[PDB]
Design a protein around this ligand. Structure first.
Ligand code: NAG
Ligand code: NAG
Ligand code: NAG
Lengths: 103, 224, 224, 224, 101
């Protein structure tokens, strides 16, 4: 349960970039967003073409196979009380999370 | 040098509440004085086109022709004559258009299937699928309403009717609505509205939510 | 001194599936020559009273002014003039009807109230209620159905509309369908279908089951 | 000039406990001391005027008078003959009316149906409906008695009695009371009081609250 | 989201709160949570319901171009700043979109 906390404090002007670990086993990834007391992290972005409504347009994904990392960037990054932004791989979302990320 | 004609579909009849008849010009030169005449089979001319369209970049010159009658007048099996005469297509035009009587008539059965558990485990957009079985006229208008107001047509994608394997005359069609997983888990409306001739009120509805599929997990008895 | 007209109601429109333009004058004289000209507002006298009744002035027109116009804008849209010359009238009594347009269109809200527990305990019968509250123009048409089969109008009777207290403009109505308790205790759909102008696609039904309130997740039973 | 006879209604003889024969004159203007003469069958019931107004909007207001007799007299069935004498009318006269006898008496059956769960879900208002069935002197007076005593008559609406579906003689009525959701949710009893002839001692009371539906023996609560 | 925008305060002041208007023509309402019941209670809605305490003192306004539902409490009899809730749909309790203490 590795817990990087990027904590980019740029607020409206900030553009948070988080690099989560990556298996590189061609499995899909996702950036979870722990939904308000549900416990089921909802995916912000993934290898699948899905991007959330709220995080659309500003969230982008970039690959580092040789560095074994996946970099997710929220460019606009306008304030939205960031909860554990877990990044994990696998078809299952909540179970497959690896690294927690707090913003 | 051929102008197609389109009989209205029951979807359009339900959508606009009024039957409309259209001829679309195709494969002509660019012109402006193209005129269209819409008449009934008895020979009395119905109200003709208004605000005809302009040319087409792909050389398939298209023009608007409109004939407006009620649902009953089209239900009367009223054949219309569609006539186009202009320099671009010098020959006079005549068209014969009808509505295929002698058909069967069954009531569609509408079953509303919730998303598979695997879709929800992706925590991504999940597909709800109104499956509309056995309706013979093969002209159906599936629609979706959430919170009592219909959703945009872009969100769901109903298919074209295809024959049902077990019964020749009957058909089927499926409508898929891709909606957010969080939206599904929070008890939603998600109703499917099927409009068909054989239906008694011509419109039927079904509703699905997270609660419908939940089974009784406890059978408390209280023997005494 | 005016020609009374009976405009078709949306209940009549939906049940008949067509409009019946009618100027049978309630309270007039029908000595002879009482021509009904079902003219349109444009002066086009279309089909007038075909199949008109007999010459009997029973302090009213026995002879009918009823016709069969076309709904879409031929009930709505414009207005329809009925110019009546009598055998004793130099100036023909004329009147146009725009289906009282100008009202405020609200969607009905339908609640199915299941039979009371005491009524089921008596076991004689049961009365399911279809409360329809909140409509805008007051002219709803309520029917009952069971598994898609429209029930006969004998066994359900629905009250006429009547001014809702809290909201001045809105109206309410009751359609009670009276079953058999042995029909209710076993699962039966008993859908209520409301046809109103302001509803989404003019129709919306809501069903009730003997198991409609019961909590689903646990089947509590007492064995004595 | 125009003679009208308004018989006492059961609602009046219940509210005031004194039957009130009514006669009225129309098509006349109000000169002075507007009234209608008063007699019984024996002529003893000579009573005083009331409801004095200067004129109608058309200056032809109907003169109003009232007479009083014992409550059981109206139900006795004997004809009552009230005179008609006023200064405006050209010639005085007299009329006779009575309660229409020979009319089957069936005991009202009163049920109280609480608002549907959807109406409570809106959290705006809630309608408690008092359904009265199987009564046929075609008369019923329903009022609402909560927390001891009488709610404002504006709150509840009682439909006119309408002839039942199965039972020819027996009628029905509905009385909806619209109250805000929080009182219902709180817990508040609301009685409904059907005053009627065929009732044992003319009055029947029913009570419904939030806890009537819930079973009392078992209490199963599902917790997450 | 809990952007309680206005804790504004005056015996005769008027508070205006902007509210997210989804526009799919759904019923949009201003709601008030009650501690005793634990369930939010409607005070204003697109359906013309005005709560008993707020008869005539609260108004609703629509801007589709701006996507704003403004609720105006014109006389604050300084009764308890409640945790008010914008929501949509025919289910007041679970349909809430934003909170506005
Ligand atoms: C008494 C009781 O509630 N238990 C029932 C029982 O009647 C039934 O035979 C069986 C399967 O339906 O198990 C329970 O659901
Ligand atoms: C429990 O389930 C059985 C299944 O047949 C059914 O008969 C019974 O009515 C249910 N219990 C109640 C209280 O309805
Ligand atoms: C009955 O069940 C409800 C379910 O929530 C519970 O709140 C209540 O306390 C129960 N009644 C009693 C007397 O405990």
């Amino acid at each position: 349960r590795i817990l990087p906390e990027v904590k980019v404090e740029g607020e409206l002007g900030g553009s948070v970039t988080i690099k989560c670990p990556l298996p590189e086993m061609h499995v899909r990834i996702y950036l979870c967003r722990e939904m308000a007391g549900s416990g089921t992290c909802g995916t912000v972005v993934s290898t699948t073409n899905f991007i959330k409504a709220e995080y659309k347009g500003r969230v982008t994904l970039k690959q580092y196979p040789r560095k074994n990392l996946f970099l997710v960037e929220v460019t606009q990054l306008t304030e939205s009380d960031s909860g554990v932004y877990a990044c994990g791989a696998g078809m299952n979302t909540d179970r497959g999370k690896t690294q927690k990320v707090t913003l | 040098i051929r102008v197609f004609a389109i009989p209205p579909s029951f979807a359009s009849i339900f959508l606009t509440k009024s039957t409309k008849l259209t001829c679309l010009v195709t494969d002509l030169t660019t012109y402006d004085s193209v005129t269209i005449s819409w008449t009934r089979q008895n020979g009395e001319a119905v109200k003709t086109h208004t605000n005809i369209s302009e040319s087409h970049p792909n050389a398939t010159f298209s023009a608007v022709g409109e004939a407006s009658i009620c649902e009953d007048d089209w239900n009367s099996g009223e054949r219309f004559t569609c006539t186009v005469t202009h320099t671009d297509l010098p020959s006079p035009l005549k068209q014969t258009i009808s509505r295929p009587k002698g058909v069967a008539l069954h009531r569609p059965d509408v079953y509303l299937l919730p998303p598979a558990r695997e879709q929800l485990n992706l925590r991504e957009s999940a597909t709800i699928t109104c499956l509309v079985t056995g309706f013979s006229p093969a002209d159906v208008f599936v629609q979706w309403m959430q919170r009592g107001q219909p959703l945009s047509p872009e969100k769901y994608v109903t298919s074209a009717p295809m024959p049902e394997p077990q019964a020749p005359g009957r058909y089927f069609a499926h409508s898929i609505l891709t909606v957010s997983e969080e939206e599904w888990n929070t008890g939603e409306t998600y109703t499917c509205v099927v409009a068909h001739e054989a239906l008694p009120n011509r419109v039927t509805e079904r509703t699905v939510d997270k609660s419908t599929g939940k089974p009784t997990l406890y059978n408390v008895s209280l023997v005494m």
